[PDB]
Amino acid sequence: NGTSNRDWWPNQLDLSILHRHSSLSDPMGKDFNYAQAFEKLDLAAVKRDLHALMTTSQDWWPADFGHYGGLFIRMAWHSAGTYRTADGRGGAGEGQQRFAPLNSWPDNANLDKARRLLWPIKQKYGRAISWADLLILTGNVALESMGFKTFGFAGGRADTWEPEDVYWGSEKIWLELSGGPNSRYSGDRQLENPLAAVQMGLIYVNPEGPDGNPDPVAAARDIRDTFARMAMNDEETVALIAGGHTFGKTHGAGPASNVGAEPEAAGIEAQGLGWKSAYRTGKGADAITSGDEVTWTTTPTQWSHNFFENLFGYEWELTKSPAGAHQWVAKGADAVIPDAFDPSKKHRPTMLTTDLSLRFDPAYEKISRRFHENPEQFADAFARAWFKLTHRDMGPRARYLGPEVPAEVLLWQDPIPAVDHPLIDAADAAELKAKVLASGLTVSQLVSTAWAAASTFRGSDKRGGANGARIRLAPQKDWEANQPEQLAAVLETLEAIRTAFNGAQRGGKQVSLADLIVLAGCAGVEQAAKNAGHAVTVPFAPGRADASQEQTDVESMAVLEPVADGFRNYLKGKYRVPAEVLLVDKAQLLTLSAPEMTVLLGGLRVLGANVGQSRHGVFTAREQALTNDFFVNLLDMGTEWKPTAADADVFEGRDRATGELKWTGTRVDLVFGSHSQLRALAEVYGSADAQEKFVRDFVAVWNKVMNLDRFDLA
Amino acid sequence: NGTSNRDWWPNQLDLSILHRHSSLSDPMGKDFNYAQAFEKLDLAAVKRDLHALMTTSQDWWPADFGHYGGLFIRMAWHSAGTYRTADGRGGAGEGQQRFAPLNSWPDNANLDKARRLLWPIKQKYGRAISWADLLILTGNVALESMGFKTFGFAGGRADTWEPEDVYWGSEKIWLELSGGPNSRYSGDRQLENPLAAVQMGLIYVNPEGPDGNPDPVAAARDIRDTFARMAMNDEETVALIAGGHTFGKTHGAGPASNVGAEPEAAGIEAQGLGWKSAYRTGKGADAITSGDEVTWTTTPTQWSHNFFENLFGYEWELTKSPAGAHQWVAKGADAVIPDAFDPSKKHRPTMLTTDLSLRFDPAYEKISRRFHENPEQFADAFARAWFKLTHRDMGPRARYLGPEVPAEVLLWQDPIPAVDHPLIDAADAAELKAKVLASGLTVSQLVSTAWAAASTFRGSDKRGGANGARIRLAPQKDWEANQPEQLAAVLETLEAIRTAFNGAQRGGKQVSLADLIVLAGCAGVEQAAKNAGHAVTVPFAPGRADASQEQTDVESMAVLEPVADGFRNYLKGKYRVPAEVLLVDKAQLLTLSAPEMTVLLGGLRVLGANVGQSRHGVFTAREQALTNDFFVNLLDMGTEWKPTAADADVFEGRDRATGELKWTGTRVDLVFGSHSQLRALAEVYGSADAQEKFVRDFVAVWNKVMNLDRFDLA
């Protein structure tokens, strides 16, 4: 097999994750805009076709109970269910279930069949509906078909054309149980961040119980922890699990050894499908997906209150499925559950270990009893939590498309108030920038503050950014990386400038504090250019609004805290992963290419954006002037670098002839002089003909960051 | 470490090689044109800087004999020396020595020092001179400075910003001796295609002899074989080796275990340098590079004919360097060779085993004696060989920039005559297209002929393409893929149309056969569109010229024969590599992305472009009509695919319900319905809204292919 750079240097840094998703891999034109296509779709027509499909059984994967609805609910719920709150990565929003590795994860077994049943609709409507939107809409139509009224639905998830680079864990074996050489668990069952599943290739938890031990109480612990890591609390979790398991069935009709290769390993003749089974007919009555053989309710194709009636109305006995999996059966019950294919056959109620957790964990039991006693509350909670599940990674409501978008504003959507007044224009922005610069705020304060406000954005789930002025709220105002005391001084001076500008206006014109933060950042960048002898205008677009503290969930904001921000040379503690790996990870969440990451970091260093005014990487003698000094001095072969005695992650730069100390830096600084691709970029900006390019490229990337969350202007 | 798709499915096909070189990874703006920048460089000022640098020693890597010339000649010969004729990949043309893996190959040890000595000049001239051109120019200036007249120099190698994907071999250990589990040799020392070096991480051969065995005669076999695979014959090989080894020295002052990590494995503080040595001062007189310790001539900083005077004026004794390497010393000679740092110390003549090859291989010996006796013949040969070496991957002479380009047209350049007459205009091209269609030639003939002419292009060394009409000449006219009897019938009809059009003109206007083949291909694609109910114009740009047989080296053209062309569903024999891997390899040589590859193949299928009118992949009932039928039929779940009995690489597609035979295909056809990323592309073009998109994208990629070699219009 051809040996690659990854084989020879398996811990060198990987920049290809910044250049994924180029116009090269994209079949659509560079002008294609999915939102526009979707806004012309006849959504009602698509939903009529999806309703028809529900009961149009295909012989190559016959519909249980004559209705694919359960299968499609699972499909939708797995699409959404890869989401991790720690980085925003996963979720339904890019349709990644159709690409490796998720198309071939064990927990996604036979979802390949679900997707292929949808090809005719996809084909008929073409680019006007993405796969990503289709997987979610199909889940919704399955619910409606079976009698459950959904809370609504938004389109606008554009398709992607290759796999996302996501850390799913370090195990080398599918479904490996914990405590191995790459265990994702340590200590008292502590799941490593950013992971949100208990075994490699599962969505959340193991349905037999933790590492296969069928203890519902301990399974509950894993459920609570994973679902929390997917942004779901106890009420939402119980509602989702019981709601989902109101429908359909599991599949475990014989031994697992009968099941063949997952899709990415199957032969070319399988045409993109996998898990071909040698057990009896391989499908339908003989299907094997998970190994469990459980049908939860007496009407699997219809919404009912039967899941909690069974859960609490029987006592449960441990038993084994025909594949050998642990599962539970109702003591003394009659055979009341219908068979999926034989009208003469009925079954006793059965449950997964993880279903019983809803009854035997003390906190879930109280919610489950309440939903049992008050089924209208169960229905409303499940509808809401299904909407959250399937929309949690879509970002601000400004991105939601179509006629079924719920009007209700939810807290998890980090809502921004509407703007209801005239915005400031170019003359006003010049006047405000002059006031900011006359107040005595420094280039370093102005740039650091705007950076702090805007760089919480992540492209993974489209959360964060400067819109909202949440930097002035709990918890962002207290984050160590934001320099709380310095921040508090900047915000007070800005709030006074604001108050005075707004008080002098006629009409209703006013400026938001969100805009003014970003504008003042722009004024600092202009001033820094002036300090370097360059006349530069930084673009600015108004229209941000200020969100209140009550519109800002403090516990949900915690995951946006930067614990590593190489752009401010900050690391909150010691991590296993080297700090340059962390930098490229942050660049990816910010949507930056390598050239953009390089320009941006070089500029920020010389503008004074480091936390604590650390001199590390400040390779200039004219701090607060916008120059390419970082690059020119980094690349100077006059200087020799060595790790310090005290700290092997800090390096001193000394004159090679005299021995004299010139600089210090971190790993994030020096990686630009080390990595052969980054140093090629640094060379371009460190050349003699590059000062104007460096300024212009810096302003462009600064502006890009300031507008990351500006979906009102998209 | 993070487990990746490559880990789980290490034999899946890798599309990412088609999406390198995106505007994402490029720090220059999308409008930057290197040739425009280079054309304004003051090349004489760069050469005067380089000339000064040759004798300006830096203490971190002191210059042997006070002169860096030998070091820089070796740098330039290794930049160029990775070139393989089999695929055109490697060579100096993209400056790849500064990226992985080449930057860290053992045979490139201490060239990192060379390149860092050139940073200050790079920095001074910035974007107007690429690293790629500078590596070469430096070698030239080193030669000039030491009294050798070069044949010339062309600029125009644009820099690249990431590593090329290249197969360098399958070994997992650097320098692994042959016969291991991934041996690049089989049979009677047969080096596998497309390799051109004897061990992983070597440029050509092992300087101690084959797998370390110090036998000059057997070493000569490895020399001849590898240089041939780099397009150099015996005369050129002797001239290059003896020419190079007229200068400088090797470095092996102590044991190799003193040498540390190569650059890609070194610490971040090494700032992109590697091979730090613990032996005495680690550099200058104590340097260790190869392990050998040989100084070939009595004036290592001056051109001379002393290499052959020594080679033939002494007898040679096998000896060991201070690092333990085999090398050879002159029996009973005086100490006449100067020491590199101590003017009081002198040495006996020494040689590598591979130097002695030039005397003890009987064919090389006759050339080496001729060069010994006639050193002006040696100087001319070396100059010409050095130009060829350092230009062989640059492409057509229309790409050569600057004031030192040699006027002599060389046969290896596959030269195209100048055009000295008015070109046809749009009205003429319309008239010719109508004439071609009225002659009775079919869509299938016209498309297959144009495809065959244009698709010889490879972007690795920019050889091939339709310019020259070499399709009408030996050897192309007889290549099996080109269907020689059908080809000859087409070309005769086209040549009569040409003769009649050119006979009717006034005023010098005429059309070349090269242009008319391309134009006729365009007429075929228009008619196929017409046949599908679509009026399109395919662009066409005239200006191709016809090359003669005498301007066509037949042996050199052999490497351009397509032995696997998935775009014509063609495989000349059985290869170890699956046919789909070969398809992606061809797409990369054609410079296509994955969407361009997918569109083009789908279209070609339904236009009748398959070799031999094979029905494999012809998934249409309206052959010669430009439609998206390939995709619609491939993606139809009504059809079930199975490998045939006779041949496991050919599949039958049968109706799932009736069993009726609908189609047959190869691996190349069915990969588009298997691989998860290619199927996502196929889905776009197989959608109900895609007919217009399909046509337009097909026309665009067709025209791209037709113009691949049109650097006269760049």
Ligand code: HEM
């Ligand atoms: C602790 C969380 C959960 C666990 C451990 C889990 C486990 C499973 C398993 C093992 C199956 C059987 C797969 C098969 O063999 O075909 C399955 C089926 C299913 N699950 Fe879940 N589940 C979880 C949560 C959810 C959620 C949140 C939903 C939706 C809101 C959901 C909806 C479904 C449905 C509809 C099916 C049936 C599919 C069919 O009829 O083909 N489950 N579940």
Ligand code: HEM
């Ligand atoms: C059979 C082909 C070749 C072999 C095996 C060979 C081998 C080597 C070796 C082992 C070294 C010493 C590396 C070190 O210790 O510093 C070297 C040096 C060098 N080679 Fe070659 N070589 C070959 C062909 C070439 C050619 C084609 C050229 C250029 C036309 C060239 C130019 C040089 C020069 C100039 C040096 C001296 C470097 C210095 O002064 O630092 N060689 N060769």
Ligand SMILES: [Cl-]
């Ligand atoms: Cl993702």
Ligand SMILES: [Cl-]
């Ligand atoms: Cl290459």
Ligand code: NA
């Ligand atoms: Na996400």
Ligand code: NA
């Ligand atoms: Na090449």
